[PDB]
Amino acid sequence: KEDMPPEHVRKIIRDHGDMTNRKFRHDKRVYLGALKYMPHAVLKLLENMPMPWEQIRDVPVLYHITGAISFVNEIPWVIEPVYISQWGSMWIMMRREKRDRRHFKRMRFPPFDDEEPPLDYADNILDVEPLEAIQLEL
Amino acid sequence: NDEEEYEAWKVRELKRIKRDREDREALEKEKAEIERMRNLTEEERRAELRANGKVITNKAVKGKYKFLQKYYHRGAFFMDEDEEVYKRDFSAPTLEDHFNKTILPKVMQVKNFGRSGRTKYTHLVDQDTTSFDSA
Amino acid sequence: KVKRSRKAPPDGWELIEPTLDELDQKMREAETEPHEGKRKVESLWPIFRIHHQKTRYIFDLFYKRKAISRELYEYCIKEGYADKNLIAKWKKQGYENLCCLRCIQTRDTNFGTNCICRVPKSKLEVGRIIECTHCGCRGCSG
Amino acid sequence: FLGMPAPLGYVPGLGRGATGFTTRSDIGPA
Amino acid sequence: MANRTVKDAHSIHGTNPQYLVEKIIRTRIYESKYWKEECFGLTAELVVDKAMELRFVGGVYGGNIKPTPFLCLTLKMLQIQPEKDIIVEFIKNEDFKYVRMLGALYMRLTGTAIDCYKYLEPLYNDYRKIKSQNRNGEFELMHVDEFIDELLHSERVCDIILPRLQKRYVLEEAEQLEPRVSAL
Amino acid sequence: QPVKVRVSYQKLLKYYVLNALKHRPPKAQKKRYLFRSFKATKFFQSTKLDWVEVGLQVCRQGYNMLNLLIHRKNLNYLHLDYNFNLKPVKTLTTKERKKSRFGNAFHLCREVLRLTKLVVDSHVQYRLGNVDAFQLADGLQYIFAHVGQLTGMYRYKYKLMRQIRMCKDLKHLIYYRFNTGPVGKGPGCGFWAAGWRVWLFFMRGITPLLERWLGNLLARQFEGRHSHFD
Amino acid sequence: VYAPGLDIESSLKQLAERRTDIFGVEETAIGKKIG
Amino acid sequence: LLTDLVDDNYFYLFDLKAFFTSKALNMAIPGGPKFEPLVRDINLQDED
Amino acid sequence: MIEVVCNDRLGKKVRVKCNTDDTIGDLKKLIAAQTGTRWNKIVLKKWYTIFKDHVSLGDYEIHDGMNLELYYQ
Amino acid sequence: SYMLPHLHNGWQVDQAILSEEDRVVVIRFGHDWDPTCMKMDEVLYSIAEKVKNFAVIYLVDITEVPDFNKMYELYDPCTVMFFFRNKHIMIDLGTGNNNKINWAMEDKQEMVDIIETVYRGARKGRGLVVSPKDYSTKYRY
Amino acid sequence: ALIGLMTYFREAVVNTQELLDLLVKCENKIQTRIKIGLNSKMPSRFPPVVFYTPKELGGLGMLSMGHVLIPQSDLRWSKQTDVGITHFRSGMSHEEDQ
Amino acid sequence: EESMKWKKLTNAQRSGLNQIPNRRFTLWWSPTINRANVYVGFQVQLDLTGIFMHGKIPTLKISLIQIFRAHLWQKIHESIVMDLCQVFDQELDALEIETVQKETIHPRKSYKMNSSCADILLFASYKWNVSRPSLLADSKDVMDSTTTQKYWIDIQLRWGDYDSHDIERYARAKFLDYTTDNMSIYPSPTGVLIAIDLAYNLHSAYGNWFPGSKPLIQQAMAKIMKANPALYVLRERIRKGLQ
Amino acid sequence: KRELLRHRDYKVDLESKLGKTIVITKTTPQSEMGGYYCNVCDCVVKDSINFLDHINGKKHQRNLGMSMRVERSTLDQVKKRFEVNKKKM
Amino acid sequence: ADYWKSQPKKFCDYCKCWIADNRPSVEFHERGKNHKENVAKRISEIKQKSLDK
RNA sequence: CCUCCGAACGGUAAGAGCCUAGCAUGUAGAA
């Protein structure tokens, strides 16, 4: 095939919402039906996780046309010397930051309330410049 | 009182404006503090003047476990709140724990004696294969 | 698109930046468009068009106007403004006015064919309503 | 009767009057 | 059903607008007496009538989860989904304060970030005292500006989890909102 | 080192030895690919999305999918919240409690989605500016080493307790390499690669099991299935 | 109390048909069809 | 994240082969892992 | 320091160490720590009886090992 | 397993349940080839003559007669159900499923006891009788 | 059985550790049998007063070769009088577990 | 059970007859086996009594259903309410009561453990100098807290266990729950709650007191627990069940 | 032809018969029986809240020639309601 | 623990059911809609069978 | 020094009786 604009899946997901609207009656079959493959998606998403030195990681996504499921169609290939060097720099940065920081504030759990619906990427995140990732000054 | 209500509303609006400005400028304040920390780590001193106390968020008290005492985790979720119930000694004995298990028979010195949910793992220091004369 | 590739855009960027900002605003407005009053597929129609229009804007600045540099063109490609595959299809003959990539994806249709809009108006029925379901165009053929 | 055939129009679930159990969730589609 | 969302309604925030109230509290509202007696067949005309009779704001109270009439009317409007400009007429009223706060809470649950800021920031200038019922059933004296501050800053207002507002400075750096010009 | 660190070293060494000893060469097989087959259909499209965005999409899809599984069986008294917690809306009768009894398939998928939601939510908190990069890494390190408390999948597949112990053992191994010198106790360690690997390898083996269980469950939802001798 | 001879013969026939672990020459599954 | 060792001599009686041998003999080296015995039904104190 | 099991039968089964002088509010805070639900969104029941936050654990006779049914608000 | 009468469609099952007003209709839902069903059917065959004054035993194949699978939750290999005057007679065996005997019974006398208890309790218009023995465990040791 | 075995040997029992552990195990198994007979749910504490109380006082009156402990929560009671309720207990102070 | 030991019973009938000793043993030790300390889990109330079953103990549920047959719980509550009404009636000139009335409560108010209304209402003649709440056995109590015109009496019955039978704490907890709540309804802010432990024959009372009320209720409850038709019926039924 | 649902302008007499005892014989009709009676529905319900559930139900409103559809009021209606209360007080 | 005694139970042949032998349960079963429907059906069946006979 | 903190089920009285739900559907043929 080819590549779709990134807004196609975003608006499909936004329109479908939480699958309670009347006009989306017919997608309740493929949505629930695709729960077999959901762990696979959960696997892929978790192996392409951004590293501490990455702010935003764009990954190829294979998404169902009805917005039922979204796989991360990628494998996190790294160059082993580069990967180990990056993580050693991460080790140095983290140890120095923990040494320097007078009062390290571990984040709270759960990050969001148990009654908060999952965030809209388009609204809350898409228009926000990210913070600085962990990086060693070379 | 209209005068008192206006004065209180003015005080609250000034406080809210100050809080909004502080919320906007706290990232810059923290960045300046980080730059000062970097300068101090660069050319101020080398572990001479502490100026540090390692302020923990919820500093619990971890007491000595008794022999064969059930492990207990205080909790993982709302630790960032500095609430006084989390600063307790959560290592205190419990249900099957006030008994001196050092006088029990070694067949009774187990966990969940008589239950079907049991394992071969005993406690810690017979799972440890290190000696104290080798190497 | 505030989120960019952690650098400065190449020379000639500010010349085309306001038009891209307007197109980005149009795209965002299309995303947030409520889907009540339209059919199920019509809500997806504007995005395609905007995307096509967006991809026209860079494609009419590097080939038919030569108004941007090569590095600027690749920067526009890498930032999601331009569609590499759509541009690659446009370079061909008979695909100059191609609306979207889905209308030529053969096996998306049931019979390994193209969209109805791909059919030229010459060999089309005279006066038939031509409303594509994938993107809603009146015939993206030559 | 043993050996007799079934009538054409007949639901042999509630043709006499009897209701199910629903013992649990993940056994049977409700 | 007395509690079904009207079948000429939108899908606010991607979900059924009634779902903007937590499900446990939604059910507790549905089984309350105020919802069955005083909140049946209500239109946006009669929501005003019930609103002018509100003596306090608040969410739920007591060991049992008992909704206040304020929260019941909020859920009733989420069900009816009155038009935006009806809600502006609700907010722009200056004589009955509880009607104004009811409209403000509906706007906070329903409106976008631009709408929320544009319509609720003018209410910082209202300092009228109000009754708010605690979780223990007691009544406290708050102010309208404090209620609006809770709407625009806190995650939970009237024991409702609010839809996540975009922070003000993000919209300010996007030019979509001019800075907050106070009365000072 | 304390006794816990020594036993952590020995247990990591034990599992390294067991992996090296039980290792058999991979078997020759035909190259089956799942996502290539999915992309070959008309029901799947491809795009390039932010990882946080696709993580939010996965969390929302898993929530919607479990919620559809619940609402299919007409369980209005049950509430699946967005942190993936099954909750009783009211006090449930025994007949309601027995009809609200799901198998380990549903609960294992629920808890895996809970862990994914926690991880993606930590990343979202990073992207919103609430939490910075160092605290994000510390949060991920905490999550992957405290799965026994943040989630509860150990009570529906208890063998994964083996993973949990490992994720604790690594936590010792890293910490006593990390908290040496000017660095004391308290949060701050963000070397989350160690536990992240362990949970990925857990998912590697659980994916076929969970997929089989959920396939059986969903087929059951739609009327489908997939002294001897005397 | 017990079925007549007709039903006994029929039941044994269907038991043989539905079990090749005890009968037949082709070693099929436990309770599947004729393999 | 690397070792200061330039030689494998540090892992004397601590490599994989040593651990396999200790597992096969129901013995644990100081710091080595403990396993269950391979041969159970032959009693090691039966030899009198 | 007594130990109370707060169980949700769907599944949230949690073990909480608490004092006898603790009110139900403090116990709810500890359950909040160990479950993730906010403490003011937790209901402690005895089959229909709702334990109230202002009453100490000793008054309710919630002894060491007793189970409390976990519901939500 | 093959001596007992067989019911070949749901109408015959309903008529067998209806045809008895003074005996307990005992129906085994399951497949004649199943090991558990054969074990249960040996016991039911050995007692079928002994209880003919107050019980009748029929067998049903849950593939050839599939109407009661969703209704009676017949998703176990063997299931034994008791009916008295067109009424399912629940029995509190102590296994948490008071509706059926979904295992194979190893004793001739225990099923006779269960059938007699069901009969005696159901004559008094009881929808649930209590089994004389608790089957919450197997008393192995 | 326990009294016959214990009065037959009387001195080899203390030296034989296998019998000493088997006595604990079998006493526990018989306690579990009664506990499961009472209820099809294994208890958590189940105080030993019901097993080791002489049959005259209503208990099962079994003999013990194990090492059963009585928690201090079991050796306490109360009585009603004219002046209210007074609380008593045997194991009053910082004593060893009985 | 002795007469039935030889009467030509079937095997199923004899098997159901060798369970009486186990039922009697379970009922004898019931305050310990059914405790919620042992058998951790949810509790279930028998729908005609205030007995909570911490675990399905079938050999005890039947012995408790037999003991509280013919609505004995409700009759015990009614008998105690009527006996308190009589004792408040004989003392209404010294106690300054203009009318003692028995409130038309729900028929099942006795075994409603989630909330309770008032059983008796006492109307003051002029006013009562009501003191702050305290236990019945508590002696020191100054009568200068507030003043009231109505005074409600509430009767609570519980079936205690070994782990939980401190009726004074139960009375304090119930009085602090019901009064400081928006679920129970009481005619006046001031009143008293009287709690009875039937399995241990204990009694206590927590709440507001007015001059002459505390000793009166002390003596009345001492005489009621010693002499009561319904309580006597319960005790005799337990005795017969235990042999 | 079903008219739209209309809000009840009358208060419900749920509390009216507290303490008022009703002696029930065989001959007594359901109208004077204990509890609440839907004269439109000819049904008896013995809770105040369950009676409210009934009079808020599909069948009760169907018997009144109504439906489960509420009128969509407009801007001027709400504004004039505001002015009406302003005038009244 | 002692001699169990069961409450009397009455069969309703109109409704093919079981109820309790006491004033309230029998009286409530008499005024049930199902009981009246069953009685009317029984009367109609009697008349129809007599006509067919 | 000893830190391994598990879970679900085996816990449904059986009836009567009246009311309202969630549900949860309802988009296909035709003259």
PDB file of N, CA and C in Angstrom, chain L residues 176-206:
ATOM      1  N   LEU L 176     -23.021   7.656  66.943  1.00  0.00           N
ATOM      2  CA  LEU L 176     -22.279   8.629  66.155  1.00  0.00           C
ATOM      3  C   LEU L 176     -22.518   8.487  64.659  1.00  0.00           C
ATOM      4  N   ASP L 177     -22.875   7.293  64.186  1.00  0.00           N
ATOM      5  CA  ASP L 177     -23.251   7.129  62.787  1.00  0.00           C
ATOM      6  C   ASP L 177     -24.610   7.750  62.513  1.00  0.00           C
ATOM      7  N   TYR L 178     -25.648   7.230  63.167  1.00  0.00           N
ATOM      8  CA  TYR L 178     -27.013   7.568  62.786  1.00  0.00           C
ATOM      9  C   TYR L 178     -27.326   9.039  63.016  1.00  0.00           C
ATOM     10  N   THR L 179     -26.934   9.587  64.163  1.00  0.00           N
ATOM     11  CA  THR L 179     -27.243  10.982  64.458  1.00  0.00           C
ATOM     12  C   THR L 179     -26.505  11.928  63.523  1.00  0.00           C
ATOM     13  N   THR L 180     -25.191  11.752  63.390  1.00  0.00           N
ATOM     14  CA  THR L 180     -24.386  12.588  62.504  1.00  0.00           C
ATOM     15  C   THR L 180     -24.410  12.020  61.085  1.00  0.00           C
ATOM     16  N   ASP L 181     -25.603  12.029  60.499  1.00  0.00           N
ATOM     17  CA  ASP L 181     -25.797  11.488  59.164  1.00  0.00           C
ATOM     18  C   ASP L 181     -27.038  12.118  58.553  1.00  0.00           C
ATOM     19  N   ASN L 182     -27.167  11.955  57.240  1.00  0.00           N
ATOM     20  CA  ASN L 182     -28.319  12.420  56.482  1.00  0.00           C
ATOM     21  C   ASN L 182     -29.117  11.244  55.931  1.00  0.00           C
ATOM     22  N   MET L 183     -29.079  10.118  56.639  1.00  0.00           N
ATOM     23  CA  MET L 183     -29.820   8.923  56.262  1.00  0.00           C
ATOM     24  C   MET L 183     -30.901   8.589  57.282  1.00  0.00           C
ATOM     25  N   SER L 184     -30.538   8.471  58.554  1.00  0.00           N
ATOM     26  CA  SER L 184     -31.518   8.250  59.605  1.00  0.00           C
ATOM     27  C   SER L 184     -32.243   9.545  59.942  1.00  0.00           C
ATOM     28  N   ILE L 185     -33.490   9.408  60.378  1.00  0.00           N
ATOM     29  CA  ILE L 185     -34.330  10.539  60.749  1.00  0.00           C
ATOM     30  C   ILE L 185     -34.648  10.439  62.232  1.00  0.00           C
ATOM     31  N   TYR L 186     -34.421  11.528  62.955  1.00  0.00           N
ATOM     32  CA  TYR L 186     -34.709  11.579  64.376  1.00  0.00           C
ATOM     33  C   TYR L 186     -35.500  12.838  64.681  1.00  0.00           C
ATOM     34  N   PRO L 187     -36.527  12.733  65.521  1.00  0.00           N
ATOM     35  CA  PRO L 187     -37.360  13.900  65.835  1.00  0.00           C
ATOM     36  C   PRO L 187     -36.584  15.055  66.443  1.00  0.00           C
ATOM     37  N   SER L 188     -35.596  14.753  67.268  1.00  0.00           N
ATOM     38  CA  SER L 188     -34.828  15.776  67.951  1.00  0.00           C
ATOM     39  C   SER L 188     -33.335  15.510  67.828  1.00  0.00           C
ATOM     40  N   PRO L 189     -32.507  16.554  67.899  1.00  0.00           N
ATOM     41  CA  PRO L 189     -31.055  16.335  67.878  1.00  0.00           C
ATOM     42  C   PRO L 189     -30.548  15.519  69.051  1.00  0.00           C
ATOM     43  N   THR L 190     -31.267  15.497  70.169  1.00  0.00           N
ATOM     44  CA  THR L 190     -30.831  14.818  71.378  1.00  0.00           C
ATOM     45  C   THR L 190     -31.632  13.541  71.580  1.00  0.00           C
ATOM     46  N   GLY L 191     -30.952  12.501  72.036  1.00  0.00           N
ATOM     47  CA  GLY L 191     -31.603  11.226  72.246  1.00  0.00           C
ATOM     48  C   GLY L 191     -30.614  10.224  72.786  1.00  0.00           C
ATOM     49  N   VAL L 192     -30.998   8.952  72.744  1.00  0.00           N
ATOM     50  CA  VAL L 192     -30.128   7.885  73.217  1.00  0.00           C
ATOM     51  C   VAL L 192     -30.363   6.647  72.367  1.00  0.00           C
ATOM     52  N   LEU L 193     -29.323   5.833  72.232  1.00  0.00           N
ATOM     53  CA  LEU L 193     -29.395   4.567  71.528  1.00  0.00           C
ATOM     54  C   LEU L 193     -29.042   3.454  72.500  1.00  0.00           C
ATOM     55  N   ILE L 194     -29.922   2.465  72.596  1.00  0.00           N
ATOM     56  CA  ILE L 194     -29.763   1.349  73.517  1.00  0.00           C
ATOM     57  C   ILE L 194     -29.499   0.101  72.691  1.00  0.00           C
ATOM     58  N   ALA L 195     -28.355  -0.529  72.926  1.00  0.00           N
ATOM     59  CA  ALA L 195     -27.906  -1.667  72.145  1.00  0.00           C
ATOM     60  C   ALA L 195     -27.887  -2.917  73.012  1.00  0.00           C
ATOM     61  N   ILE L 196     -28.364  -4.021  72.436  1.00  0.00           N
ATOM     62  CA  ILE L 196     -28.461  -5.309  73.110  1.00  0.00           C
ATOM     63  C   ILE L 196     -27.662  -6.331  72.319  1.00  0.00           C
ATOM     64  N   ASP L 197     -26.777  -7.043  73.003  1.00  0.00           N
ATOM     65  CA  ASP L 197     -26.053  -8.172  72.436  1.00  0.00           C
ATOM     66  C   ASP L 197     -26.772  -9.434  72.883  1.00  0.00           C
ATOM     67  N   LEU L 198     -27.474 -10.067  71.942  1.00  0.00           N
ATOM     68  CA  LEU L 198     -28.308 -11.219  72.250  1.00  0.00           C
ATOM     69  C   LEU L 198     -27.493 -12.490  72.430  1.00  0.00           C
ATOM     70  N   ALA L 199     -26.406 -12.644  71.682  1.00  0.00           N
ATOM     71  CA  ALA L 199     -25.560 -13.820  71.807  1.00  0.00           C
ATOM     72  C   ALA L 199     -24.718 -13.809  73.070  1.00  0.00           C
ATOM     73  N   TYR L 200     -24.578 -12.660  73.721  1.00  0.00           N
ATOM     74  CA  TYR L 200     -23.831 -12.554  74.961  1.00  0.00           C
ATOM     75  C   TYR L 200     -24.637 -11.926  76.083  1.00  0.00           C
ATOM     76  N   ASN L 201     -25.896 -11.574  75.831  1.00  0.00           N
ATOM     77  CA  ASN L 201     -26.786 -11.013  76.843  1.00  0.00           C
ATOM     78  C   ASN L 201     -26.157  -9.791  77.507  1.00  0.00           C
ATOM     79  N   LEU L 202     -25.633  -8.901  76.674  1.00  0.00           N
ATOM     80  CA  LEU L 202     -25.065  -7.642  77.127  1.00  0.00           C
ATOM     81  C   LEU L 202     -25.989  -6.500  76.732  1.00  0.00           C
ATOM     82  N   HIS L 203     -25.857  -5.375  77.425  1.00  0.00           N
ATOM     83  CA  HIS L 203     -26.651  -4.208  77.077  1.00  0.00           C
ATOM     84  C   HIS L 203     -25.872  -2.953  77.421  1.00  0.00           C
ATOM     85  N   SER L 204     -26.002  -1.940  76.573  1.00  0.00           N
ATOM     86  CA  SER L 204     -25.402  -0.644  76.848  1.00  0.00           C
ATOM     87  C   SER L 204     -26.251   0.430  76.188  1.00  0.00           C
ATOM     88  N   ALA L 205     -25.894   1.684  76.439  1.00  0.00           N
ATOM     89  CA  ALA L 205     -26.643   2.804  75.882  1.00  0.00           C
ATOM     90  C   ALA L 205     -25.705   3.986  75.741  1.00  0.00           C
ATOM     91  N   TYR L 206     -25.689   4.593  74.563  1.00  0.00           N
ATOM     92  CA  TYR L 206     -24.900   5.789  74.311  1.00  0.00           C
ATOM     93  C   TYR L 206     -25.808   6.900  73.819  1.00  0.00           C
TER      94      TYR L 206
END
